[PDB]
Amino acid sequence: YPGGVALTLAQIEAASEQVAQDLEQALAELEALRLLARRDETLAPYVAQYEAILEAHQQAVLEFEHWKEQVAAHPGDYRRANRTLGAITARHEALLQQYADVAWAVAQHVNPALLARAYTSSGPRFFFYVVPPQYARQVNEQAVPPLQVVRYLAAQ
Amino acid sequence: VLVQGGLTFHDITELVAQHTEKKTPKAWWAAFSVAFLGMLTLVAMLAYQVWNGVGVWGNNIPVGWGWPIVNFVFWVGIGHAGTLISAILFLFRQRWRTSINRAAEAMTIFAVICALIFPTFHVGRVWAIYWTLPIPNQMEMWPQFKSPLLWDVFAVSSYFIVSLVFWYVGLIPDLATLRDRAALMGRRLRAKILGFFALGWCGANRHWRNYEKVYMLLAGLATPLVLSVHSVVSFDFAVSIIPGWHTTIFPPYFVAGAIFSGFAMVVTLMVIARKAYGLENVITIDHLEKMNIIMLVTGTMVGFAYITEFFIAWYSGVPYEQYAFINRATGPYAWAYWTMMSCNLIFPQFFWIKKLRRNIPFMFIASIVVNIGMWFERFVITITSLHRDYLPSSWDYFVPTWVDVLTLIGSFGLFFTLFLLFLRFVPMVAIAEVKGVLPEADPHF
Amino acid sequence: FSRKTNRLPALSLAGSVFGGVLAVFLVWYYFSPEFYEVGYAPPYSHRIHVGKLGLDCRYCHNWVEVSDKANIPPTQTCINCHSQILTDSPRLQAVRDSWATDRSIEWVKVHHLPDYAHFSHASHVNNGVGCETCHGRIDQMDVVRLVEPLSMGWCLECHRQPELYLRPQSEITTMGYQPPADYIERNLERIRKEGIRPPTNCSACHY
Amino acid sequence: PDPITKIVWDNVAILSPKTAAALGVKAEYHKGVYIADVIELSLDGRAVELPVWVLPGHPDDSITVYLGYGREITSTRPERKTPFFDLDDYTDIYGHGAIATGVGVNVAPLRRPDNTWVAYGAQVRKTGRTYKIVTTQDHGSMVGRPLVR
Amino acid sequence: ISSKPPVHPNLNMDFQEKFEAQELNPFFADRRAMRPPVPGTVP
Ligand code: HEC
Ligand code: HEC
Numbered sequence A: 001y002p003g004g005v006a007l008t009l010a011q012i013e014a015a016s017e018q019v020a021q022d023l024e025q026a027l028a029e030l031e032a033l034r035l036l037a038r039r040d041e042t043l044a045p046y047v048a049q050y051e052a053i054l055e056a057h058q059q060a061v062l063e064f065e066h067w068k069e070q071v072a073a074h075p076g077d078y079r080r081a082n083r084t085l086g087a088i089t090a091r092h093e094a095l096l097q098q099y100a101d102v103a104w105a106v107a108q109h110v111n112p113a114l115l116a117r118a119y120t121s122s123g124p125r126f127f128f129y130v131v132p133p134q135y136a137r138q139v140n141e142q143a144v145p146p147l148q149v150v151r152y153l154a155a156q
Numbered sequence B: 001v002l003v004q005g006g007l008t009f010h011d012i013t014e015l016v017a018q019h020t021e022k023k024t025p026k027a028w029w030a031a032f033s034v035a036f037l038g039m040l041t042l043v044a045m046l047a048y049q050v051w052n053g054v055g056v057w058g059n060n061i062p063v064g065w066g067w068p069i070v071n072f073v074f075w076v077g078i079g080h081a082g083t084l085i086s087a088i089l090f091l092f093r094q095r096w097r098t099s100i101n102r103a104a105e106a107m108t109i110f111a112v113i114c115a116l117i118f119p120t121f122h123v124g125r126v127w128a129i130y131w132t133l134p135i136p137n138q139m140e141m142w143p144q145f146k147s148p149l150l151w152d153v154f155a156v157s158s159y160f161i162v163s164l165v166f167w168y169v170g171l172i173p174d175l176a177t178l179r180d181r182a183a184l185m186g187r188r189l190r191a192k193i194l195g196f197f198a199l200g201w202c203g204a205n206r207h208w209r210n211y212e213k214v215y216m217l218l219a220g221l222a223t224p225l226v227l228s229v230h231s232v233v234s235f236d237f238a239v240s241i242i243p244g245w246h247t248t249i250f251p252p253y254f255v256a257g258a259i260f261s262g263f264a265m266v267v268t269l270m271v272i273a274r275k276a277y278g279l280e281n282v283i284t285i286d287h288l289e290k291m292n293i294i295m296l297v298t299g300t301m302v303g304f305a306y307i308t309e310f311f312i313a314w315y316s317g318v319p320y321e322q323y324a325f326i327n328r329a330t331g332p333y334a335w336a337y338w339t340m341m342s343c344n345l346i347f348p349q350f351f352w353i354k355k356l357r358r359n360i361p362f363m364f365i366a367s368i369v370v371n372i373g374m375w376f377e378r379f380v381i382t383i384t385s386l387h388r389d390y391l392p393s394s395w396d397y398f399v400p401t402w403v404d405v406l407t408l409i410g411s412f413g414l415f416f417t418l419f420l421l422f423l424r425f426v427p428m429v430a431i432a433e434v435k436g437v438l439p440e441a442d443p444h445f
Numbered sequence C: 001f002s003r004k005t006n007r008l009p010a011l012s013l014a015g016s017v018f019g020g021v022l023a024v025f026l027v028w029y030y031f032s033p034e035f036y037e038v039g040y041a042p043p044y045s046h047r048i049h050v051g052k053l054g055l056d057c058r059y060c061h062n063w064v065e066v067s068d069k070a071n072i073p074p075t076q077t078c079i080n081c082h083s084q085i086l087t088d089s090p091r092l093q094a095v096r097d098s099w100a101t102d103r104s105i106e107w108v109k110v111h112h113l114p115d116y117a118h119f120s121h122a123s124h125v126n127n128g129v130g131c132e133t134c135h136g137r138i139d140q141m142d143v144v145r146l147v148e149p150l151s152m153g154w155c156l157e158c159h160r161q162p163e164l165y166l167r168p169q170s171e172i173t174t175m176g177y178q179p180p181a182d183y184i185e186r187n188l189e190r191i192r193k194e195g196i197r198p199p200t201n202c203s204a205c206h207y
Numbered sequence D: 001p002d003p004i005t006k007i008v009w010d011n012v013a014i015l016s017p018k019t020a021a022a023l024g025v026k027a028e029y030h031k032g033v034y035i036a037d038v039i040e041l042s043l044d045g046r047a048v049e050l051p052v053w054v055l056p057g058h059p060d061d062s063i064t065v066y067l068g069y070g071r072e073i074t075s076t077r078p079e080r081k082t083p084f085f086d087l088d089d090y091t092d093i094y095g096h097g098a099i100a101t102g103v104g105v106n107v108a109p110l111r112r113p114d115n116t117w118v119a120y121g122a123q124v125r126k127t128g129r130t131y132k133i134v135t136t137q138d139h140g141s142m143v144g145r146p147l148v149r
Numbered sequence E: 001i002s003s004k005p006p007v008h009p010n011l012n013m014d015f016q017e018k019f020e021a022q023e024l025n026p027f028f029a030d031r032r033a034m035r036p037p038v039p040g041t042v043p
């Protein structure tokens, strides 16, 4: 338990700022999606399919303050920062991942192809004798956008 | 007056000494044979068990438990009787318990021994039960304190202790008396050296006052524990979602069951501890008379709950809890509940006739029958609503195996085996307070 | 009775106090009954294949980057080089015969945590954990000490306090690795980015 | 378990209560284990018996005797006795022999091979050896409960 | 240090009755769990 809680309090802040910058991006995309696919799809559940995440993402912001303030209030318990940080990044990467799964379907209808830039798209585990996932994570990371997914569809 | 005996302060010591003076009983040699044989049957089937597996008991999965934990509630519900007449009767200070008290925490502590074996053994993995304890173990693991099966452990691992330490402290003047006799008249000169449990006793002012407030303390500090021990062992049932359990009146109820079970055995011991090896002058029959009230209290308090059960089925029950008690009366266990409730209600409401039926031989034939319903009370309440609970798919009768019964029997075996063992060594009667309370110990003479 | 049992509370108290002292300063529960240097069928001597032959670990412990429960090599690996490098020793005639037969090499193992608590190297290695931490510094090890217990209470200290251990994944299999200064803050920036989120639960390995 | 009736480890004969109450057999249980009567059906002098179970679905004068379950098997492995102190018979399902022995009665040889699913002429004889028959469900027919709706 | 296989008291579930890959199999000619595949097979 190296040096207390105050060390981790810098990186937990560095996560919440990524969320705050994504309030802009998600709500910005929520404008753009209404602009891009006005009538090119069902859009009646499928637009709200993107909004339903948004009320959760904003709800976690007020929480991420409450999560964090319960840590910075008393820096004498190491077994809350690793957990609050493990919760944030999961509650963060989830919402990043949930935005994507709803956003890849956008291309799936506008384009007849959900693109080959969709995911790592590696394969099953027995397809490691040919393709270790190491290759794949350097494909996915260096090709796939987290939330530049629909702005990418402004190029289409 | 509450004891009928032409005694003085000395007359008890010569008599209880004669009950612990020399070692040559014959009925002992029969009891230690049949009882230890009962204990042999117990372990003959209890290690036969663990080398093989749980299912030799008659337990299906819906009714996972069967007779073992039923007997745990029995062999602890039977035991609260002994500790509470040590505690309660000092809280109300009825100055009446003295004739029987010291023989009772025995009747509790050995019940707790043959009780605690069941939670250690109706499990399938006995060896991995120390994990249940909150030791900082070989990893970063610890038990789950939302589990009444754990509360049971701390409770019984405290209730074996507090009832003991309150009994051991209860019997200090005995060891003083026996340590005092071992020199001048007794077994050997080397019984004195065995009686160091006196712990430098002299009966002094400086610490006898402390003994009183401690006996007060443990009275007002073991009763709040007794009302939590059996309540824990009821919480394990009623905390559940089962309709026949989730009814909230059960913890007071099972406690009253522990009353109506425990005194229903103490009388079985006192009758047979009154005929051959008896104390006519100290175990006054008027004592058993005023004893069966607090039984007959729970002869009706137990009965009122059956009404509530049988009522709430008609008042605002779930459509399952509606069925849960129709099962109890009408269904497979009609042999149990119709007769059980009637057994536990007829005989108490047939008990008070001739001024509480002071007659001694009726006590034995009744105190059994009052208790047999208790083993049904916990075989009914637990199991009769543990099958036929929220599915028809989980409908299965409970066929008890021939090994279920030899464990029940063996519980009587080890109980009598070890209850008799120390009882022949320690003195039966609480001789310290007997000659100190009702006789002329009062300074008004 | 006896006059000097004033000394008797001492042996009652002290010997009871020593009951605690002898209990807790004696435990060594997963440090005494773990570590051992077993006698193999042939002695591999990781010393030589690593310490003065300069092989990294992915050669013959293949499928540690991609699999779970990475494999001890087959006999075939020795036949890459010990078909025609030595051809002399009275130490591995089991090996040459084994390639010339079908009875595989009778390998004992270590670190055998039970098979009700599964494990995956690739889940760790790809996410930056090294063999120095867990399997010990093997580069000078004629036979395996298993210097770490590989029990839960130690298995879990990393999943609660990971950033004291994890490697940057650049040349992870380097036994002579001193980490840098400002190690920790250089690491947490990866858990913020890489998003590893170690497991604390029952679901991970015990199933 | 068969889907009709959660039956295991025995061939059976399923039929109506109206034939059962007109034949004289039952699926009585006083222990939640379904003790069962028998039939001793007899075709052309090739009779065998089997447990009768009852179902409220089947029609008059008809029984669906399932096949298999009467297939004698000859074991190479030992019966694997252990001391009476140890349980093996209840656990060692592969012990007393291989599996297919005595699990039920063989029924295929009885029929007539003309339209060789059906058959007539079973001079039923309600006889003894009324032994167990086991299920998982053990019951049925929820009392108007919210479980399928 | 403790050169023998160390004391593990509860051996109930260490060495499961089933056997994973690369584990002893006391049945076959070649004591081995893999039982390699016949030629011609295809994933
Ligand atoms: C590089 C960093 C690593 C190498 C090279 C190896 N390990 Fe691991 N390892 C660990 C355990 C608990 C086991 C036992 C597996 C089981 O019992 O199921 C293993 C296994 C191996 C083996 C083979 C031995 C076997 O078959 O059991 C090899 C060759 C091996 N490991 C090499 C534990 C850990 C661990 C801590 C988390 C780490 C980081 C690694 N192992 C990583 C490496
Ligand atoms: C082949 C040329 C090897 C090289 C290079 C390395 N290892 Fe090794 N390893 C090898 C074998 C055949 C064995 C079996 C052990 C025996 O009884 O001889 C091992 C053993 C290990 C182990 C212990 C596994 C076990 O037996 O339970 C570990 C953790 C291990 N090897 C790791 C390891 C690392 C990290 C290496 C490079 C740094 C390495 N090995 C080299 C084969 C070969």
Ligand code: HEC
Pocket (backbone or CB within 6 Å): C042, C043, C044, C045, C048, C049, C053, C060, C073, C077, C078, C079, C080, C081, C082, C085, C089, C090, C091, C092, C095
């Ligand atoms: C080529 C890359 C090698 C592979 C693959 C393996 N080994 Fe090796 N081994 C190699 C050399 C060049 C040497 C000799 C170095 C020296 O110090 O003399 C060795 C040595 C051994 C020995 C020692 C032989 C003895 O002293 O009697 C053993 C037991 C040995 N090697 C075993 C071994 C095994 C079992 C291997 C596969 C699992 C293996 N080696 C791989 C070179 C190479």
Ligand code: HEC
Pocket (backbone or CB within 6 Å): C113, C117, C118, C119, C120, C123, C124, C127, C129, C133, C134, C150, C151, C152, C154, C155, C156, C158, C159, C162, C165, C166, C195, C196, C197, C198, C199, C204, C205
């Ligand atoms: C560092 C010192 C570690 C030790 C020791 C152990 N683990 Fe680990 N583990 C570690 C990290 C950094 C991670 C997360 C990587 C990520 O990107 O998520 C993990 C993860 C696991 C998992 C993940 C779940 C899965 O994929 O199935 C498992 C099952 C796991 N670790 C198991 C495990 C066991 C059984 C260990 C000791 C016996 C163990 N880990 C030690 C880092 C470290």
Ligand code: HEC
Pocket (backbone or CB within 6 Å): B131, B139, B141, C113, C114, C117, C150, C151, C152, C155, C156, C199, C200, C201, C202, C203, C204, C205, C206, E010
């Ligand atoms: C790895 C990812 C684990 C996690 C998370 C947890 N456990 Fe653990 N446990 C693990 C191992 C590898 C071992 C073996 C230690 C040994 O004694 O050799 C254990 C041990 C246990 C045990 C003891 C088993 C024994 O044989 O003594 C228990 C009861 C246990 N673990 C429980 C447990 C629980 C309840 C956890 C979370 C809910 C848990 N473990 C986390 C691996 C891992």
